[PDB]
Design a protein around this ligand. Structure first.
Ligand code: Y97
Ligand code: ZN
Length: 316
């Protein structure tokens, strides 16, 4: 039969595009392997006339693409791009509305934990290592968080419609960002066993699991010592742009101006709902596209963020 072809662009980073000639008789999958147009899988679909000019994503099948893919995503997981494209198909459909001057996500596909995380990332200082995140992030701040959310699902290995832990999610994001300059100095004191001082750098220097109160952490928190007689851990020094204090959800009261933002989780383990509370002129509770405003907030808080620069204890 007659041979008909169009020119298109393949890519892995939608930054470097390589001109290709495709045969309409054959499916895209036969010609380039797995292929995706805006997350849409066209691997088993024959080319149309409309497809001409358009940019398709493909798996790296040569050293050039593998090098290009690694530079953009700081990863070599063969499934990665398929998952990022799979998530993207769904994420584009979501509506991201600007709520209180910050981009958020109207609820769908259990996206409540992402919206919450996304609002958090707009309020704190974070330089992502991989250009893929840097780039999607910049656009996410502008009001187009589709790719940023898609990349987050691909990076966090989550499937659309599956709920996720906001702390676990942010832990992954920090692991892929520049926190090398972050430093923490915790002193532990036992009446029996003495004082032991430890230094934490990187993610371990901004996240903490067991209290929501930054001030409590500074005053000191009781922890079980090796001996079996309880000992007190307290914060001696903190160099970081923020800190994340996390604990199992409990009834907490947030006062205006004493924090940056918290994550409220209501419901049972792994099947709850997430709401975002921010401190500005007054307290702001952001639930999807819904916004509530109040002077005082009492709810089951599980994560609190606090902007910080340099802090040193006045203890001893
Ligand atoms: C949503 C989700 C997805 C995946 C995972 N898995 C990964 C963590 N490592 C693997 C966890 C999560 C989770 O539920 N994240 C909340 C903050 C949380 C964290 C810790 C404990 C609890 C609760 C225990 C009992 C409860 C009943 N409800 C309370 C009782 C008082 O107020 C509300 S919640 C919840
Ligand atoms: Zn001890």
């Amino acid at each position: 039969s007659e041979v008909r072809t169009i020119k298109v662009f393949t890519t892995v980073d939608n930054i470097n595009l390589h001109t290709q000639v495709v045969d309409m008789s054959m499916t895209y999958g036969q010609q380039f392997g797995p292929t995706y147009l805006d997350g849409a899988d066209v691997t088993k679909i024959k080319p149309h006339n409309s497809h001409e000019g358009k940019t398709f994503y493909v798996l790296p099948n040569d050293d050039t693409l593998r090098v290009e893919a690694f530079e953009y995503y700081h990863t070599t997981d063969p499934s990665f791009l398929g998952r990022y494209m799979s998530a993207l198909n769904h994420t584009k459909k979501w509506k991201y509305p600007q709520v209180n001057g910050l981009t958020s996500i109207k609820w769908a596909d259990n996206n409540c934990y992402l919206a919450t995380a996304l609002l958090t990332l707009q309020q704190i200082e974070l330089k992502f290592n991989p250009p893929a995140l840097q780039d999607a992030y910049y656009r996410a701040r502008a009001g187009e968080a589709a790719n940023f959310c898609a990349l987050i699902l691909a990076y966090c290995n989550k499937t659309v419609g599956e709920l996720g832990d906001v702390r676990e999610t942010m832990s992954y994001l920090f692991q892929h960002a520049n926190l090398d300059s972050c430093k923490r100095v915790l002193n532990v004191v036992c009446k029996t066993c003495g004082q032991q001082q430890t230094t934490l750098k990187g993610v371990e220097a901004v996240m903490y699991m067991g209290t929501l109160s930054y001030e409590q952490f500074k005053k000191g928190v009781q922890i079980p010592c090796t001996c079996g007689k309880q000992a007190t851990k307290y914060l001696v020094q903190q160099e970081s742009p923020f800190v994340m204090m996390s604990a199992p959800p409990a009834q907490y009261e947030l006062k205006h101006g004493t924090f940056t933002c918290a994550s409220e989780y209501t419901g049972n383990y792994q099947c709850g709902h997430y709401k975002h509370i921010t401190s500005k002129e007054t307290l702001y509770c952001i639930d999807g596209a819904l916004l509530t405003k109040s002077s005082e907030y009492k709810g089951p808080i599980t994560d609190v963020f606090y902007k910080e620069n340099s802090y040193t204890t006045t203890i001893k």
